[model samples]
Target: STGSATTTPIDSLDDAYITPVQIGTPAQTLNLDFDTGSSDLWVFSSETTASEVDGQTIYTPSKSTTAKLLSGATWSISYGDGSSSSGDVYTDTVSVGGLTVTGQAVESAKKVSSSFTEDSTIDGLLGLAFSTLNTVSPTQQKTFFDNAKASLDSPVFTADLGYHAPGTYNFGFIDTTAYTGSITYTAVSTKQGFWEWTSTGYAVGSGTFKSTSIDGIADTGTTLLYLPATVVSAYWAQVSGAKSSSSVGGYVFPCSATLPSFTFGVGSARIVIPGDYIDFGPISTGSSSCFGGIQSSAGIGINIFGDVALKAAFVVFNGATTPTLGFASK
Candidate 1:
């Protein structure tokens, strides 16, 4: 079976793109972030500390007859930003779009980080990474995709994200009509529990391609594009008024600057990120300075090809034994 879910961005800068999900028998609707960076289908719930919850929706397991506590199962996840969340586990009916899965492991957040709590639009995270990265102990649970794979027409899922617009996420089969041109397929390493690959260098605007093997992970959870210091510096250097400042941290430039487009390669295919997409908006209200969407990965350890890159291409996550990632122009 297959289904298509419409995922939407919450802020003007596309800080968070979330999709509506149905949880439990009574169907508690919550807007969950489809985070491919981590593996743990967790959500806010009635068990969460009252003070920890701001305006986000919470799932009350007791309200569903189908909900069953995963005896002794508990989970806790820590993100790259040092923020964390811990919770209790339950198995219940979890539905995305129209693809329904019974007894899906759903972690109910008992506590969340201040950063997560403040993001009122997102009620939880629906992790799409390898189940090996799941944080649960005693008896680890499979990710929603992993559990639903056997039922799918093909063990694959596709993400068609659009700039400043709602994205479409589909399960089972790739929609041929959704993308333009042929798909450029590349191998992915699941050994590290990520959709990791070595991108074939990059080019700033319409400049030359470096043809270097730049390793990074495809992360839907992360908000920006992070590359090697050399790549980041080179891109910014081309922008006339751009500077890597200390006050606001990272790169900033003139808001009115004619920002150049950025391009990255997937094997033989090139995905071009529009110039306006890199203009991350003003540093502050009434400010002439704007933040650069492309940043250095030096501090983050691993390079991240996040939403900024993904939105420019149609991505297919192949769940085959020999996993592969497919990219296409949309």
Candidate 2:
């Protein structure tokens, strides 16, 4: 069970889930997901022609006083969720919170879908995730945080996702309240920036089944918890009265139900997905309450624990430590 963790004095709201930071700024002010899994900061553009994608905030190249273009390069990315984007490269004078950097690399997607181009509130993505994935690096690429780390009061970067409420994720300084202690660091082989890990299996209610573990890389870029059929089948069997309903996806079970608490053990620690997460149910039509467990990817090779598993624990990518992966509390 998640202990009674309380919110602190940190400011919660920032305009972007992945905010931009320039060379000469104070600290990160924008709210953003620092996705280390992929690189490239993209936002909506006004030049988009689709009516389905209007009113979104497009980052205009003319507006940034310090913007520069990365000539001779065009970039494209396809995510694990099947979302894809392509664009031209430009370096711009961008700022997040008070932190500012100059000649920072950014991507202005030339071809974006309605889901990306229609949202007006978020200006763009600050791809602090990885520089290699940003469409610019053929070899060792540096991330926004990697460049900005030199200017920070501390070299460490911390993310405090609003698990139950609204709060901005921070860079540079680890919000002490976000995790239970100084992040337990791990060191990974730098062949790739993506922090890889293994899932040893999970526990729903109170049962532990080790042989049923799932294998995949954990990604913040993904939105849902995707597991294979073999594992999910083994899991659903433990849920009570969870009959398949054509009206709703098989994942949805009886609504008037109480889902017991569950946890995911990933070698280092066991992450608990609380009962409330299951209670939230399916998010859309023909979708029942989420019931906290999903059975979507039947034959998928990789089991991705996206934001669903990330928000539950204090994750640490100990690139500096020998083992590479570590977890802690705020």
Candidate 3:
């Protein structure tokens, strides 16, 4: 009734987290990003052009006895990160961790953007958001999580993203031992099929909690934390020599700058992001000036609580009668 998978960061930057998934009858294992912000379980597949394919693994539907083409079903998805893929759909046996789903929709990518093709570390994406976000035409197919939800012990899943270590994604049950302190639960707004929630507000290191509504999506696919321009400005102004540079993109500060921790409210609880997590890494390999993990969401349109904030706590995505999101210390 429950399943778990180990999530590993593709690189030291923790740009994205990938988990192994088995698709089809012969069972092709592929490293997939379990994205909570999208609702398409798409993959780089045999149908993809050889030129568009890098060193990443591809799913071959012909190799699986259970594979069957979904007549006329096609899908296309674009991410906020500007990467996209599109292709026809097939139904097959799919499994993640120890859970299995029969006749799960497996989108085979015929075309992929340069960003995804260049990143050989990721073979596909397994979306965990609401099935309403599905992009399949005629009929939007359910996500891997939605297909397996009925058999789970509970209509919920958990994300525990780590900084420098492997984290976990569990379905159907919440591992109590994986987190600390009482979880703060709140109502979720699935208006756009996203696991969207409202943060009470945020504060700089050791500062008083700011009481304001900051509605945003809990996106695991995104790499950085994006907040309102005012919120981002407040945090950066506290750091000495911080500048919002368009050249390197976004905000940058001295490596030696006194980086302060960031705190955001969930219900009545506050999750604090370590100061170093904000200092990202040097702008480039050996550069002294460092880019900030927290950036302004001015152009992004929506404030996004991405990997930078998610890694700071254990998050529960509840799909029960009343969908809710829970946050707990870990």
Per-residue CA lDDT of model 1 for 238-326, tens digit only, reads 99989999899899999878999999999988999999888889899999999999999999999999998999999999999898899
Clashes of 2: 40
lDDT (Cα, tens digit) per residue for candidate 2, span 156-272: 454454554543444455455656644444344444546666666677667764544565555655555677765566566666766545565456656666766667766655677
Which residue pairs come into collision in candidate 3? none
Task: Return whichever of 2 and 3 wins on TM-score.
Answer: 3
RMSD for each of the candidates? 0.8, 5.8, 0.9
Worst 10 residues of 1 by lDDT: 275-284
Count clashing residue pairs per candidate. 0, 40, 0
Per-candidate TM equals 0.98, 0.77, 0.98
Candidate 2 off by > 4 Å: 1-33, 50-52, 118-121, 137-141, 153-155, 181-193, 209-214, 243-250, 283-293, 296-299, 319-323
User: How many clashes does the backbone of model 1 have?
Assistant: 0
Sort every candidate by lDDT, greatest first: 3, 1, 2
Scored by CA lDDT, what does every candidate get? 0.92, 0.54, 0.93
Model 1's lDDT to the true fold? 0.92
Q: On residues 1-330, what C-alpha lDDT tens digit does candidate 3 reach at each position? A: 888999999998898999999998889999999999899999999999899999999999999999999999999888887888999999999998989999999999999999999999999999988999999999889998889989999999999999978999999998999999899999999888899999998889988889999999999989899999999999999999999998988999998887999999998899999997776889888999999999999998998999999999999999997899999988
> On a 0 to 1 TM-score scale, where does candidate 3 land against the true structure?
0.98
Lowest summed lDDT window (length 10), candidate 2? 1-10
